[PDB]
Structure 1
Amino acid sequence: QLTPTFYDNSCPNVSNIVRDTIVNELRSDPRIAASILRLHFHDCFVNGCDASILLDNTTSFRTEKDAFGNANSARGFPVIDRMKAAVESACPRTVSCADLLTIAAQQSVTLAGGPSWRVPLGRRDSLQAFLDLANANLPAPFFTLPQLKDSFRNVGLNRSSDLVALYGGHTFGKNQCRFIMDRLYNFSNTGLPDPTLNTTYLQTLRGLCPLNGNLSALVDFDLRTPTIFDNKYYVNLEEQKGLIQSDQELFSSPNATDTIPLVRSFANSTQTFFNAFVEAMDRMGNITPLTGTQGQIRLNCRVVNS
């Protein structure tokens, strides 16, 4: 069983080292806390939270970094390297990359204003990476609600509360124009915008993301508080101001009978949201871990030990 006290004897200052690393990086990259949370999500959804995403290419397997959901998108890898080196310096050969990334995600959420909790620990590191599985398992922003639900179920998260709460990760961070062009200009081959996008916000987004513009330009997921971890994400949805199709689907899908009341409850209460977010995060962090003597304590997060 994973346990929050796992390093209390062997590396008691691990969360502190992780915190200071993020605090320091945030001075020059305000986006890093968002990026790190996303890294952990992408770890967990592919063979579980086993740091498989941190591995670079080898001649026998391809890196997940070249997945459709990771390439030219996922970021923060050198920051993870830095906190890893610092922990190895304090606590040699003790803390797994999988656990380190889990703590990093939690600390990132707290540093951005979100809930504070101790994550379960004891995960171990994969002996390979899973590119095809990453391409199969990471959901895409054009997914319908039933597709999103299938994608969460596929990895062991059956509950609509899992989906709606973890979606609150879009309370901060950035999204490239490429992922919303259809909503803005040609939704579902209509040549018209997505009708569930508020028309005032549509104009703003078209201004940031013109047809024939730079597809890599970044826009904030949360128009209310772009860098603060809070429940404002859900208030946006109630106003038809979710950024990506999958955001707005939680509130507007014909299949949203079960998700609408979760969105509303989380918009109405910070405490309700934060409680559900911590619960869902810990469920996601419990996806198929290696434990005990399985896998490794990887010394360099990019390569399996030899």
Structure 2
Amino acid sequence: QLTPTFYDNSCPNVSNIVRDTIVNELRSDPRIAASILSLHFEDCFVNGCDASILLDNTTSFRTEKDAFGNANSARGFPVIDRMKAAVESACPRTVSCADLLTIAAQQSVTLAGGPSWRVPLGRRDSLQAFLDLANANLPAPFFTLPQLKDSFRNVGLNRSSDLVALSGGHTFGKNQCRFIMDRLYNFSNTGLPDPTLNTTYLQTLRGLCPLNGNLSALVDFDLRTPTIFDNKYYVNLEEQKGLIQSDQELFSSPNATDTIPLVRSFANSTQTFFNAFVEAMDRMGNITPLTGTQGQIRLNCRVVNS
């Protein structure tokens, strides 16, 4: 029952406040738009988009920020706090952190040159965080295509289009050397690099991520347009230049019969990709939301109301 007009009466300027906050942050951190999108994904894949990922530790439950997929990965929490503080100033106790993060993600995509649309709203905030669920539900860069599909299906995204379109979020942002060392020097204990990685690109990546080098070194997901949200991610895949294993599998996996055509279509048309991304983003944002009087309107994203 989520609706795009949910705040048109209670907080008509919420999207503008959010956009303004992101634009300002971009002045000093060009990577923030990508970071925010990642946070929304991490939120929705664990108990749905309920801002559970924003909660800090409490003696009763551990924060999802300590999840293998979020620890020393997720960022931008201070930026979310800032925009939440701004919205709270404009319209007190009105906009949930869950919705706030959803709008922020959409605005981030648009600000990076992606499609523009109004996301459905009306989500409310969880009363707890789910670390174990996060460790079990979040997909990993070393996942095979069947595992990626299972991961998505497990949270309610049954369509291959959901996986291929949303994976396009990697059209911008950074990844650590840590997650590709296997593809570069010892893939699946074969003692060789991943055969699905373009050999010329392999040399470049090896130069950025030498054996015994800094594993925390950041590398661009998209070698074509690192900070621009476009369909270049898919063009890379067609050339065997996906950065992480999970990226390239969409095009090269023996189980990719249903994903290859989508990859090609998105690489072939920017419009086709943008439509599917919007479609998939809203589906992901529709995963088990708390609505009505369920949950609360958290005043501080970091802790439950007291």
3-state DSSP class of the match of 2:202?
Answer: helix
- TM-superposed CA distance for 1:13, in Å, is 0.1
Q: Distance between the aligned counterparts of 1:149 and 1:13, measured in 2? A: 38
Q: Deviations over 1:123-157 (max 9, x none)?
A: 00000000000000000000000000000000000
Alignment of 1:162-177 (within 5 A): 162-177=162-177
TM-score of the two chains, using structure 1 as the length reference? 1.00
Q: Deviations over 1:154-204 (max 9, x none)?
A: 000000000000000000000000000000000010110000000000000
- TM-superposed CA distance for 1:277, in Å, is 0.2
- State the superposition RMSD in angstroms: 0.2
Alignment of 1:1-306 (within 5 A): 1-306=1-306
Q: Distance between the aligned counterparts of 2:175 and 2:70, measured in 1? A: 13
- TM-superposed CA distance for 1:279, in Å, is 0.2
3-state DSSP class of the match of 2:180?
Answer: helix
Q: Deviations over 1:29-64 (max 9, x none)?
A: 000000000000000000000000000000000000
- TM-superposed CA distance for 1:67, in Å, is 0.3
Find runs of 4+ consecutive structure 1 residues off by over 4 angstroms.
Answer: none
Q: Distance between the aligned counterparts of 1:302 and 1:188, measured in 2? A: 39
- TM-superposed CA distance for 1:95, in Å, is 0.1
Q: Deviations over 1:64-99 (max 9, x none)?
A: 000000000000000000000000000000000000
Q: Distance between the aligned counterparts of 1:137 and 1:74, measured in 2? A: 16
Q: Distance between the aligned counterparts of 1:235 and 1:48, measured in 2? A: 31
Q: Distance between the aligned counterparts of 2:270 and 2:194, measured in 1? A: 29
- TM-superposed CA distance for 1:19, in Å, is 0.1
- TM-superposed CA distance for 1:296, in Å, is 0.3
3-state DSSP class of the match of 1:175?
Answer: strand
3-state DSSP class of the match of 1:60?
Answer: coil
Q: Distance between the aligned counterparts of 1:29 and 1:298, measured in 2? A: 27
Q: Distance between the aligned counterparts of 2:234 and 2:248, measured in 1? A: 10
3-state DSSP class of the match of 1:193?
Answer: coil
3-state DSSP class of the match of 2:146?
Answer: helix
Q: Distance between the aligned counterparts of 1:48 and 1:188, measured in 2? A: 32
Q: Distance between the aligned counterparts of 2:234 and 2:190, measured in 1? A: 28
3-state DSSP class of the match of 1:100?
Answer: helix
Q: Distance between the aligned counterparts of 2:96 and 2:111, measured in 1? A: 22
Q: Distance between the aligned counterparts of 1:188 and 1:14, measured in 2? A: 47
3-state DSSP class of the match of 1:273?
Answer: helix
Q: Distance between the aligned counterparts of 2:191 and 2:175, measured in 1? A: 22
Q: Distance between the aligned counterparts of 2:274 and 2:292, measured in 1? A: 31
Residue correspondences, number: 306
Q: Distance between the aligned counterparts of 2:265 and 2:177, measured in 1? A: 30
Q: Deviations over 1:194-231 (max 9, x none)?
A: 00000000000000000000000000000000000000
Identity of aligned residues (%): 99
Q: Distance between the aligned counterparts of 1:104 and 1:47, measured in 2? A: 19
Q: Distance between the aligned counterparts of 1:50 and 1:240, measured in 2? A: 36
TM-score of the two chains, using structure 2 as the length reference? 1.00
Q: Distance between the aligned counterparts of 2:60 and 2:192, measured in 1? A: 45
Q: Distance between the aligned counterparts of 1:100 and 1:138, measured in 2? A: 21
Q: Distance between the aligned counterparts of 1:38 and 1:48, measured in 2? A: 14
Q: Distance between the aligned counterparts of 1:189 and 1:65, measured in 2? A: 30
3-state DSSP class of the match of 1:65?
Answer: helix
- TM-superposed CA distance for 1:276, in Å, is 0.1
